[PDB]
Amino acid sequence: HQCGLPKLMALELFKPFVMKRLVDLNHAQNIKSAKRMVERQRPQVWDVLEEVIAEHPVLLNRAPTLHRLGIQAFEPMLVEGKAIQLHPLVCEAFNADFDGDQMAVHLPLSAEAQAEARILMLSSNNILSPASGRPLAMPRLDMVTGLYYLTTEVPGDTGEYQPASGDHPETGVYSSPAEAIMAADRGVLSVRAKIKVRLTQLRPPVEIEAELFGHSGWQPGDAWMAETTLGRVMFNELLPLGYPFVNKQMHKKVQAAIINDLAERYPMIVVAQTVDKLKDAGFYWATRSGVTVSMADVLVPPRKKEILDHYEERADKVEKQFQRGALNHDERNEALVEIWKEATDEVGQALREHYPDDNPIITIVDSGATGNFTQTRTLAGMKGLVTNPKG
Amino acid sequence: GYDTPLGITNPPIDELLDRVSSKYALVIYAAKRARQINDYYNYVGPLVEPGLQEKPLSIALREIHADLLEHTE
Amino acid sequence: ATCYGRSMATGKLVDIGEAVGIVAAQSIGEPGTQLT
Amino acid sequence: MLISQRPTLSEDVLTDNRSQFVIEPLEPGFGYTLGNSLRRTLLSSIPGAAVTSIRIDGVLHEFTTVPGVKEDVTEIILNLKSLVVSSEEDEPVTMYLRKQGPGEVTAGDIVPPAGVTVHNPGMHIATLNDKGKLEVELVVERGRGYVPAVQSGAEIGRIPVDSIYSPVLKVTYKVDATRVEQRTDFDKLILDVETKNSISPRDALASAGKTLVELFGLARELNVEAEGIEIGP
Amino acid sequence: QRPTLSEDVLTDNRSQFVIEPLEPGFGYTLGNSLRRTLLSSIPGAAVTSIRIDGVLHEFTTVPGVKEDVTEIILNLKSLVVSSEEDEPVTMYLRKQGPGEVTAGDIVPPAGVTVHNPGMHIATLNDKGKLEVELVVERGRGYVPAVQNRASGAEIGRIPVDSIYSPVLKVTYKVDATRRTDFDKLILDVETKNSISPRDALASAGKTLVELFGLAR
Amino acid sequence: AMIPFLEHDDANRALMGANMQRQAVPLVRSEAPLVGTGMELRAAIDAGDVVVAEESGVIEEVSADYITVMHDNGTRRTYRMRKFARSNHGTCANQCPIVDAGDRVEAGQVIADGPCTDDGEMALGKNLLVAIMPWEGHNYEDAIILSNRLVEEDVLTSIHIEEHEIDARDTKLGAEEITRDIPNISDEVLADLDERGIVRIGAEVRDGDILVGKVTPKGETELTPEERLLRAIFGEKAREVRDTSLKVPHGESGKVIGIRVFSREDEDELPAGVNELVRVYVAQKRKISDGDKLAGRHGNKGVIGKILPVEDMPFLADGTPVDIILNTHGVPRRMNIGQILETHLGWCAHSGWKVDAAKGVPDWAARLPDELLEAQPNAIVSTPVFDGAQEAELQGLLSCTLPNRDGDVLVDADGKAMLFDGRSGEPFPYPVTVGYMYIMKLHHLVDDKIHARSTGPYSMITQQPLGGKAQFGGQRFGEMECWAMQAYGAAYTLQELLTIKSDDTVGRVKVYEAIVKGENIPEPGIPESFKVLLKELQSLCLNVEVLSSDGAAIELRLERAAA
Amino acid sequence: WLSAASFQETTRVLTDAAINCRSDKLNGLKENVIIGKLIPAGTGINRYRNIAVQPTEEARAA
Ligand SMILES: [Mg+2]
């Protein structure tokens, strides 16, 4: 529900408000002097400015305005610089990316205008797509990957619970989540290691709740044993108490499912705060996720040569068929198109096989963070057929 | 069941809208109350402890949250 | 309102003053640039 | 050289053992310079005692289950690791818990040898079934932070546990933007600290501050030249 | 067991510092705190303004000098100088060519020391005459040029960016040792000839102690 | 032809890279790309912004102002250096000589560098230490994170020169006069004006300051009642002028580089009725800032999201903090890995290398490498398009990187390296691709694009706010925006936006008066544009008429002053 | 006829309107936008725009 306005912008927009509060206080003798002062940027104004802007909404718009979410209300806070700071979750609604686009700011003056901005057009109140009901103000790329890494289960990770057959008991039991945090501070527990912890402040799945409690016999104090990763614990902590523990690697689709559920069952303010917490966590763990690009991470399929040779043999057969006078020119083109589409799909398949599933270029696509596998296939492998000037 | 909201998001929108049938009714409600307050400062209210320099509209919204006001469509 | 049903954005029943027409025009036009 | 204007420390009390501290406003950038340091000092530089190992009567090899009691071995290890114990005998000390017959055991049922203390006597440990006895030996010793299971040995009947020495349980921190005159990007540090009942959050913060100050005086010893001076401590 | 801090010298302007012992998973934080303070808050000396008689603003040339005033001020950014005054002092520089005006040709007032007389400043030919007046102040970190309306300055002054920090490049490693574990922190400081690594680390520790004194 | 690894870039991003090279702004100090094509030199030369020796000789004299070469046949040729010249788009054309007295120069040799050139090669940007990894969202969705070094060391600083102009001409009520004597202005405000009323050279002008004082003959009917009484009682003269002085526009500042002046008195040719005309040339040093637009040669554009302190920038083992953090999520879908190959080769060139020749030349380096078998730090290499650096050879070079001062190899054979979080202190768990990338400062800067307005000039025809920053205009609330507003049901917001912020000629002054006096905003009136529509219809012979509920046509068309 | 004139084919619409001496009730929201009246939608509905609000007695007391 916030946005960052350059100081100079806010000073110019609220100029009359700041002049009024400069005459209220005795910084300015008369109103003409208040104007002259605000124009010279005398240091007295800045303090006063932050007072006038208190809880005074402003509208942000990006063109083209395709649907109403193209104009959204925000509470403004002063920012250092000459640029508008925009919350990332709203980007989807505006189709706004930071490759240089700009946005416009409008200041509602009348009381009814400010009220319409606070109630009708407040960013927090517009989490959902007015066209589809799906959620838009939702983790999009980095956030997604972040969470997708934080909620992955890595077989054999550090500190993994191992029920030991020797005299040593199993070593992956942690009294509370905080004990797991401590263990991970030392190189003893990976956030993605399949462990077992006693959770005291998170609801369990419906089934475990039915067994270990009454159908609703769960209260905040009631603890219980969970078999998850520390990451999935830290994730389910971001969702509200009442939500049952999920324990899945948070693909974008599953995050969408959770946000849909929350929007359907919960107030909207809670949903907005949940998406904001997800944002923060996803950014942190995305930084910590180790996704990079590198000439070595772009593995080329090792079977590419033989695949291409085989489909070239087929193509030479078709071309000799044409020279024989047995194929139609359009039929020759049609046969070559089928051959090469198949060869492209085959090299894409070999690529997807050869690539380890933790390869960053694969992680970014599969998690739903950004991009499709056709791009992965044209980058390594082969671009395939390209269109004609005609089409 | 929710953390203490910040500024605009306070009071929560769901609890405010429970006091009215629709969003637009609440809009006009609060705008009328805020104009009334600002007239008072130059006419009734405020009806709750006014903030340090709380915007009249914010005071009106708070009054709406405490049911200190009645209306008729 | 009832013939129209839920307001896709608010998730509740559409309010008595909505301009469902413009919202429909937008919901239909916004994805226009995806039609190939 | 210049000086810093009005850095202060405030406290808000969420519980009688959980508090949030706010250091504000710091010059831009120092929030992170002194946040992770304070967190790791709180979680790793406070002397505290806790259970190091236990010997349970009736099971020494299998560790599968305990006769006459519902809880299994691992649930008991977990219930014990959450014990709050303060010991002055810096050398290893032993305690014994004994109970019998149908009923329920707690922390007060254990006999604390002279010098050590138990702060949450109302805590649960296990439930004895009909004709159910329970005799257990516990080891307590000073330490700091969290040390994994230290292993076992040649004396069957004793299992080492994870020693949660640290008197502080959970610590987190964030850095928000505060406005010093004409600057909206000054740093304000917020520290959430949930501790055990051995000491209040304020005392833990004070101990961490003293230990840190000693550490950095190590470096201040090399020489005495000018440095950022502050008005209020 | 109390921790000890042992210095080691590699050159007149680069010292390592071994701190040990430290609780495991704790040396990185100490090293990084020291690095941040060193890179940000080591009091030093730098130039604040300069004045060149023949010139009224930066964007111009001086007859007979190969470098325009902009390039002159850029070359002057490379100056390393230390002043004990703690108040605006002034240095001077006259020179008639042919010849290469370097930093040595500056007459620092008693109390201010110029540490790299070899640094190039300008080249002058037969018709070239340079006459400069450089205000030196004491500050910390980085402070961009102070405007001529923010000060009572007349149209002559040419304010310049002040890079006060005398610390050049700081890094660190830690050796971890695992039942009785401990970390050894090897901090690495390199500074300009302005002050020594020892003195830089000392002031850093002083500021860090003063700041952590908020425990109370 | 200047995009390294072009064949590795899709045509969309390559087209963008060409177009964005043509937008780089000259920097105060120019640095040729550490990895380029072969075209930078020839492009710079043919372009004609570098000084080139027309005739081989010997440098007889060199100054910041000119360069004289004595040919061998006794001829003298001299070249005047363009010094701080304003270009058609505000960039700074500034030549510097690269010869020393006594140097023997051949014909065609480059004598002085131009705006974006270095030793005769097109230098459109700088070589930056780049780390490819998402960093705390501040490089989310194409934003870019910069090390504050690039500010402290002016690595992306540029000079921008604007030309303000103003003329005193003949009006109906007389003729304007350029005068330092302006009605009721504080002596201190004019403190930087000369006797003529023109700002003094080298004066630092903030936004709002006077640049050239000018008064315009005002009529007597326009004198306010206050001014009427003031000129009557104190027996004022009959000048009755208005302050039409040339002030510096919003969001602008700088040192006055220059002043040019043309007088009708002198034999200076000017248009009809134009007595005097003065032009103030003002320069400003722009440091890279939040909002500025950077880009590589591979169509990989982005605005700067945040400029971090050098201390919390991720840094290598030796404390070397990276200069720029480029979000990983942006590379793979744009099909411009060219930037990655460039990063790898750039690190190679920044560290230098030595392929091990003992026992033969490895097969990967056998094909191309001739004098590339070794290279000193900061070597200048060119990888032509559709030729040059091959992937195998790139990897090979990456294997034999030379070490740093302490004999530490910082970037491994994959092109990655461990990095520390300059914020917490802990190292980042996985190796990151670090390298050296050529980044240009594109001519799209916040300083040029920020703009706000509370109230300003309106159009005499539509009576709506003027359009454009240059005219201190207002934003246009377009038809699609009104659609959006309606979809929300924000009736009052839409009305206000369309009546008391644009067209209500009395409503807007009422609104300002009400904000200044802490009173509620009044009810809105009638858009002037509607009256104008009616008038146009009428002029079309259409009898339009506004009617009451049950009535005839409504018509459209002192006490406060006496108080 | 105002709406039509502003949508498309201004010339023909205006000519037919002049001939047929048309009269615009000024009831569509685009029309009100043109004339600067509160659009009849959302907060522009009659029940919403004329709401009366006075503080209750129990609150007016304290
Ligand atoms: Mg864009």
PDB file of C-alpha atoms in Angstrom, chain A residues 283-385:
ATOM      1  CA  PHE A 283      13.685 -11.799  -2.293  1.00  0.00           C
ATOM      2  CA  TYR A 284      16.040 -12.798   0.528  1.00  0.00           C
ATOM      3  CA  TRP A 285      16.200 -16.450  -0.459  1.00  0.00           C
ATOM      4  CA  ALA A 286      16.383 -15.585  -4.159  1.00  0.00           C
ATOM      5  CA  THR A 287      19.557 -13.664  -3.400  1.00  0.00           C
ATOM      6  CA  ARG A 288      20.744 -16.707  -1.431  1.00  0.00           C
ATOM      7  CA  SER A 289      19.601 -19.191  -4.126  1.00  0.00           C
ATOM      8  CA  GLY A 290      22.744 -19.280  -6.278  1.00  0.00           C
ATOM      9  CA  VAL A 291      21.058 -18.856  -9.673  1.00  0.00           C
ATOM     10  CA  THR A 292      23.528 -17.548 -12.258  1.00  0.00           C
ATOM     11  CA  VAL A 293      24.223 -17.790 -15.967  1.00  0.00           C
ATOM     12  CA  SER A 294      27.536 -18.952 -17.382  1.00  0.00           C
ATOM     13  CA  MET A 295      28.825 -20.404 -20.635  1.00  0.00           C
ATOM     14  CA  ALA A 296      29.332 -23.661 -18.721  1.00  0.00           C
ATOM     15  CA  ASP A 297      25.803 -23.732 -17.294  1.00  0.00           C
ATOM     16  CA  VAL A 298      24.489 -23.605 -20.883  1.00  0.00           C
ATOM     17  CA  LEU A 299      25.078 -27.272 -21.581  1.00  0.00           C
ATOM     18  CA  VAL A 300      24.773 -28.342 -25.211  1.00  0.00           C
ATOM     19  CA  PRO A 301      23.088 -31.719 -25.854  1.00  0.00           C
ATOM     20  CA  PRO A 302      25.719 -34.400 -26.520  1.00  0.00           C
ATOM     21  CA  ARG A 303      23.531 -36.248 -29.059  1.00  0.00           C
ATOM     22  CA  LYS A 304      22.899 -33.159 -31.222  1.00  0.00           C
ATOM     23  CA  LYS A 305      25.275 -34.145 -34.022  1.00  0.00           C
ATOM     24  CA  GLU A 306      23.795 -37.624 -34.539  1.00  0.00           C
ATOM     25  CA  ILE A 307      20.186 -36.393 -34.328  1.00  0.00           C
ATOM     26  CA  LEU A 308      20.862 -33.719 -36.945  1.00  0.00           C
ATOM     27  CA  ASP A 309      22.692 -36.198 -39.185  1.00  0.00           C
ATOM     28  CA  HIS A 310      19.736 -38.605 -39.062  1.00  0.00           C
ATOM     29  CA  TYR A 311      17.152 -35.962 -39.911  1.00  0.00           C
ATOM     30  CA  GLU A 312      19.475 -34.686 -42.649  1.00  0.00           C
ATOM     31  CA  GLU A 313      19.457 -38.197 -44.104  1.00  0.00           C
ATOM     32  CA  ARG A 314      15.655 -38.074 -44.088  1.00  0.00           C
ATOM     33  CA  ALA A 315      15.736 -34.627 -45.707  1.00  0.00           C
ATOM     34  CA  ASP A 316      18.116 -35.828 -48.425  1.00  0.00           C
ATOM     35  CA  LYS A 317      15.736 -38.718 -49.073  1.00  0.00           C
ATOM     36  CA  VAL A 318      12.892 -36.212 -49.487  1.00  0.00           C
ATOM     37  CA  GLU A 319      15.002 -33.990 -51.757  1.00  0.00           C
ATOM     38  CA  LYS A 320      15.956 -36.953 -53.946  1.00  0.00           C
ATOM     39  CA  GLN A 321      12.259 -37.847 -53.970  1.00  0.00           C
ATOM     40  CA  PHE A 322      11.550 -34.358 -55.308  1.00  0.00           C
ATOM     41  CA  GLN A 323      14.312 -34.553 -57.929  1.00  0.00           C
ATOM     42  CA  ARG A 324      12.838 -37.925 -58.932  1.00  0.00           C
ATOM     43  CA  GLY A 325       9.682 -36.038 -59.895  1.00  0.00           C
ATOM     44  CA  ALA A 326       7.635 -37.862 -57.243  1.00  0.00           C
ATOM     45  CA  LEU A 327       6.968 -35.060 -54.724  1.00  0.00           C
ATOM     46  CA  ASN A 328       5.083 -31.785 -55.048  1.00  0.00           C
ATOM     47  CA  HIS A 329       7.106 -28.632 -54.401  1.00  0.00           C
ATOM     48  CA  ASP A 330       4.597 -27.653 -51.725  1.00  0.00           C
ATOM     49  CA  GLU A 331       4.644 -31.316 -50.695  1.00  0.00           C
ATOM     50  CA  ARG A 332       8.452 -31.202 -50.542  1.00  0.00           C
ATOM     51  CA  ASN A 333       8.292 -28.137 -48.299  1.00  0.00           C
ATOM     52  CA  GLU A 334       5.615 -29.827 -46.166  1.00  0.00           C
ATOM     53  CA  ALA A 335       7.730 -32.961 -45.716  1.00  0.00           C
ATOM     54  CA  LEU A 336      10.825 -30.914 -44.875  1.00  0.00           C
ATOM     55  CA  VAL A 337       8.813 -28.923 -42.330  1.00  0.00           C
ATOM     56  CA  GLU A 338       7.604 -32.086 -40.606  1.00  0.00           C
ATOM     57  CA  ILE A 339      11.133 -33.520 -40.605  1.00  0.00           C
ATOM     58  CA  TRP A 340      12.692 -30.406 -39.095  1.00  0.00           C
ATOM     59  CA  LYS A 341       9.969 -29.840 -36.502  1.00  0.00           C
ATOM     60  CA  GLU A 342      10.577 -33.412 -35.342  1.00  0.00           C
ATOM     61  CA  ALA A 343      14.348 -32.901 -35.262  1.00  0.00           C
ATOM     62  CA  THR A 344      13.923 -29.737 -33.191  1.00  0.00           C
ATOM     63  CA  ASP A 345      11.664 -31.491 -30.699  1.00  0.00           C
ATOM     64  CA  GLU A 346      14.132 -34.389 -30.479  1.00  0.00           C
ATOM     65  CA  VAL A 347      17.083 -32.109 -29.710  1.00  0.00           C
ATOM     66  CA  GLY A 348      14.938 -30.336 -27.126  1.00  0.00           C
ATOM     67  CA  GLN A 349      14.165 -33.704 -25.534  1.00  0.00           C
ATOM     68  CA  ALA A 350      17.828 -34.744 -25.467  1.00  0.00           C
ATOM     69  CA  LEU A 351      18.638 -31.361 -23.932  1.00  0.00           C
ATOM     70  CA  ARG A 352      16.026 -31.689 -21.189  1.00  0.00           C
ATOM     71  CA  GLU A 353      17.340 -35.182 -20.424  1.00  0.00           C
ATOM     72  CA  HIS A 354      21.019 -34.210 -20.255  1.00  0.00           C
ATOM     73  CA  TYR A 355      20.420 -31.167 -18.062  1.00  0.00           C
ATOM     74  CA  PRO A 356      20.596 -31.833 -14.315  1.00  0.00           C
ATOM     75  CA  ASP A 357      17.410 -30.627 -12.676  1.00  0.00           C
ATOM     76  CA  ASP A 358      19.306 -28.227 -10.384  1.00  0.00           C
ATOM     77  CA  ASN A 359      20.917 -26.495 -13.361  1.00  0.00           C
ATOM     78  CA  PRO A 360      19.956 -22.804 -12.978  1.00  0.00           C
ATOM     79  CA  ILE A 361      18.598 -22.480 -16.524  1.00  0.00           C
ATOM     80  CA  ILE A 362      16.298 -25.408 -15.747  1.00  0.00           C
ATOM     81  CA  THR A 363      15.424 -24.255 -12.226  1.00  0.00           C
ATOM     82  CA  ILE A 364      14.289 -20.845 -13.487  1.00  0.00           C
ATOM     83  CA  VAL A 365      11.930 -22.273 -16.120  1.00  0.00           C
ATOM     84  CA  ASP A 366      10.525 -25.269 -14.231  1.00  0.00           C
ATOM     85  CA  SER A 367       9.778 -23.437 -10.981  1.00  0.00           C
ATOM     86  CA  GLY A 368       7.492 -21.146 -12.985  1.00  0.00           C
ATOM     87  CA  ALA A 369       9.719 -18.146 -12.279  1.00  0.00           C
ATOM     88  CA  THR A 370      10.110 -16.850 -15.836  1.00  0.00           C
ATOM     89  CA  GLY A 371      10.378 -18.133 -19.393  1.00  0.00           C
ATOM     90  CA  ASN A 372       9.451 -21.277 -21.310  1.00  0.00           C
ATOM     91  CA  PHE A 373      11.477 -24.280 -22.463  1.00  0.00           C
ATOM     92  CA  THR A 374      11.359 -23.192 -26.120  1.00  0.00           C
ATOM     93  CA  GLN A 375      13.848 -20.516 -25.090  1.00  0.00           C
ATOM     94  CA  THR A 376      16.012 -23.119 -23.354  1.00  0.00           C
ATOM     95  CA  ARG A 377      15.844 -25.135 -26.592  1.00  0.00           C
ATOM     96  CA  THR A 378      16.835 -22.272 -28.905  1.00  0.00           C
ATOM     97  CA  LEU A 379      19.653 -21.193 -26.556  1.00  0.00           C
ATOM     98  CA  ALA A 380      21.290 -24.623 -26.324  1.00  0.00           C
ATOM     99  CA  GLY A 381      20.273 -27.126 -28.962  1.00  0.00           C
ATOM    100  CA  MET A 382      18.780 -25.393 -31.992  1.00  0.00           C
ATOM    101  CA  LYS A 383      16.444 -22.550 -32.910  1.00  0.00           C
ATOM    102  CA  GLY A 384      14.678 -24.652 -35.529  1.00  0.00           C
ATOM    103  CA  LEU A 385      12.626 -23.371 -38.422  1.00  0.00           C
TER     104      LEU A 385
END
